[PDB]
Design a protein around this ligand. Structure first.
Ligand SMILES: *[C@@H]1O[C@H](CO[C@H]2O[C@@H](C)[C@@H](O)[C@@H](O)[C@@H]2O)[C@@H](O[C@@H]2O[C@H](CO)[C@@H](O[C@@H]3O[C@H](CO[C@H]4O[C@H](CO)[C@@H](O)[C@H](O)[C@@H]4O[C@@H]4O[C@H](CO)[C@@H](O[C@@H]5O[C@H](CO)[C@H](O)[C@H](O)[C@H]5O)[C@H](O)[C@H]4NC(C)=O)[C@@H](O)[C@H](O[C@H]4O[C@H](CO)[C@@H](O)[C@H](O)[C@@H]4O)[C@@H]3O)[C@H](O)[C@H]2NC(C)=O)[C@H](O)[C@H]1NC(C)=O
Ligand SMILES: *[C@@H]1O[C@H](CO[C@H]2O[C@@H](C)[C@@H](O)[C@@H](O)[C@@H]2O)[C@@H](O[C@@H]2O[C@H](CO)[C@@H](O[C@@H]3O[C@H](CO[C@H]4O[C@H](CO)[C@@H](O)[C@H](O)[C@@H]4O[C@@H]4O[C@H](CO)[C@@H](O[C@@H]5O[C@H](CO)[C@H](O)[C@H](O)[C@H]5O)[C@H](O)[C@H]4NC(C)=O)[C@@H](O)[C@H](O[C@H]4O[C@H](CO)[C@@H](O)[C@H](O)[C@@H]4O)[C@@H]3O)[C@H](O)[C@H]2NC(C)=O)[C@H](O)[C@H]1NC(C)=O
Ligand code: ZN
Ligand code: ZN
Ligand code: ZN
Ligand code: ZN
Ligand code: ZN
Lengths: 207, 207
């Protein structure tokens, strides 16, 4: 019997309209003695609002049981600790796992948009670059928009640890050169805990 | 046998030149079986640089033992967790205590200086007021200075929880009216984790 404790989806923690949840999964439950009890604690205080699902048999003759605890937007961002305790008559002691948001002093990202390189302006499609740097912790979301619609022809690098202990990344949006020359406004949209309302956007256009 | 785990002095965490330390104290050690072992962990990783003092007998026929772990300035501010584990042959299991810096999103104080009330200007001594508001967490240090020397005739209120979840306080420095009228410059000096370099000062003078 092993326990895995998963954090909420990062975007779910940065948008007050969403519902972040922590997920506790127990595997290798022997379906001879498959009795499983979950206890949940927030900063050591037991809470009772988790939603545990019925066990599901696995093809390897073991059971798997999942319990989901909803977490408050402010609680997660304020560093509360979530402990999942799993009890079972086959273990010499209960299994405990604790999780929290990534720790450390927060640092606000600086968001910079970079136009296509001059040499790239000869190609049929061009690269629009969004540099996000100086942020901590590394949890972040980046998307692109133009004229009130998503621009989804982009790829974003993972966060990279910079020499000052903050993170940076780059996002690359590829557009037809004609749309760049025509002067459309493209926006790099960034979500990170340390931005005001966890959100900022920076625009990019021919100039 | 009971264990108490104490945080560093708040000023010691805010000045890089100082040495913050966490202090683990075990009392009611029965000096029949007074064998005591400390284990220390930083975010669950065992560390070995604590300095444990020799036991001291108490007048109530018990022992008291103290162990001191130095903590790094950045580790404390970045929210690392310090666990002191105390083992003794008389307890059914070891005693664990964990401590960290006060949790929660940090908020930078706003520091405002307020001159004496007009009605107070008739008295022999006047009150110089420093309002510090909007800060989180509540750990803070406030002192007063003038012309490169400490002004120590002051009292500061405890932090008070404000309606937006931040803290405020006031500090009152009492000076001779003649020094206020003469135009001396008085400075409210504030240390808090969320200030740049954890330090700011605001001046007050007749104007
Ligand atoms: C018996 O079978 C058991 C059932 O598994 C079956 O496996 C399939 C491959 C089948 O083909 C078949 O073979 C089996 O029927 C099997 O259980 C497995 O046991 C593994 C350990 O032995 C365990 O491995 C761990 O996996 C962790 C990652 O798990 C995630 O990703 C994998 C895919 O990579 C996926 O299978 C899981 O379901 C997990 O997926 C994540 O789940 C969370 C929780 O729901 C999601 O988070 C939520 O997402 C929602 C939306 O989806 C919301 O956002 C919500 O708010 C969130 O909370 C998350 O999105 C989702 N991600 C993805 C990408 O799907 C590893 O982290 C873990 O690793 C540590 O691992 C070891 C230490 O143990 C070391 O390498 C490292 O130290 C590392 O730190 C570990 O690898 C499997 O997860 C588990 N499978 C399941 C389904 O639970 C069992 O082993 C079998 N027994 C025997 C004896 O064979
Ligand atoms: C047998 O005797 C034992 C020895 O005590 C003697 O008591 C004296 C009064 C004598 O007159 C005589 O009676 C005895 O010989 C006795 O041990 C005591 O046991 C108490 C519990 O039973 C325990 O109470 C706890 O006290 C905590 C506060 O302790 C601090 O403050 C008190 C004074 O208020 C002081 O006595 C302590 O020494 C502690 O002082 C703090 O110590 C820390 C660590 O050094 C300092 O932090 C460091 O400071 C340095 C610079 O100084 C640096 O800054 C460094 O970086 C820092 O880490 C700190 O500065 C210092 N502060 C001060 C102001 O001095 C309470 O927090 C605790 O409370 C919780 O308490 C209960 C739960 O248990 C509840 O009320 C609450 O839930 C609350 O949350 C608790 O009250 C005593 O501390 C302890 N005494 C000592 C000296 O260790 C034992 O009980 C006797 N046994 C019997 C059976 O009678
Ligand atoms: Zn319950
Ligand atoms: Zn913890
Ligand atoms: Zn928020
Ligand atoms: Zn050691
Ligand atoms: Zn510092």
């Amino acid at each position: 019997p092993s326990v895995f404790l998963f954090p909420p989806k990062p975007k779910d923690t940065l948008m007050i309209s969403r519902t972040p949840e922590v997920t506790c999964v127990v595997v290798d439950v022997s379906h001879e003695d498959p009795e499983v009890k979950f206890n949940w604690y927030v900063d050591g205080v037991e809470v009772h609002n988790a939603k545990t699902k019925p066990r599901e048999e696995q093809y390897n003759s073991t059971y798997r049981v999942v319990s989901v605890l909803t977490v408050l937007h402010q609680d997660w961002l304020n560093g509360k600790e979530y402990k999942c305790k799993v009890s079972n008559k086959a273990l010499p002691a209960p299994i405990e796992k604790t999780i929290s948001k990534a720790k450390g002093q927060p640092r606000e990202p600086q968001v910079y948009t970079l136009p296509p390189s001059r040499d790239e302006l000869t190609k049929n499609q061009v690269s629009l670059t969004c540099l996000v740097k100086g942020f901590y912790p590394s949890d972040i979301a980046v998307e692109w928009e133009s004229n009130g619609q998503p621009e989804n022809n982009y790829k974003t690098t993972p966060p990279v640890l910079d020499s000052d202990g903050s993170f940076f990344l780059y996002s690359k949006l590829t557009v037809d050169k004609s749309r760049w020359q025509q002067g459309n406004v493209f926006s790099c949209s960034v979500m990170h805990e340390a931005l005001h309302n966890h959100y900022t956007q920076k625009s990019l256009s021919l100039s």
